[PDB]
Chains A and B, each alone.
Chain A
């Protein structure tokens, strides 16, 4: 969708800074969260880190 793409564009380099190799996969996963959780991700470095690591071990297990 047009809106989730804009979200994804803002989120992507931030995820890439922490997971250069899986940024595309992780961003797409992240974009399935509730609006509320997405907002929090945008607003909060620490909150995003938590989701990114969450996403990481869902992938590797």
Chain B
């Protein structure tokens, strides 16, 4: 179940 509230991911 996919989730519009997931945190955004931040590469390095």
Contact = CB atoms under 8 A, between A and B. Distances in A.
A32 interface: yes
Interface in B1-12: 1-4, 6-12
- Chain A's interface size range is 10 to 19
B8 A28 contact: yes
B10 A24 contact: yes
B12 to A, nearest CB: 7
A27 B4 contact: no
14 contacts: A8-B9, A8-B11, A9-B11, A9-B12, A12-B9, A24-B8, A25-B8, A28-B8, A28-B9, A31-B9, A32-B1, A32-B3, A51-B2, A59-B4
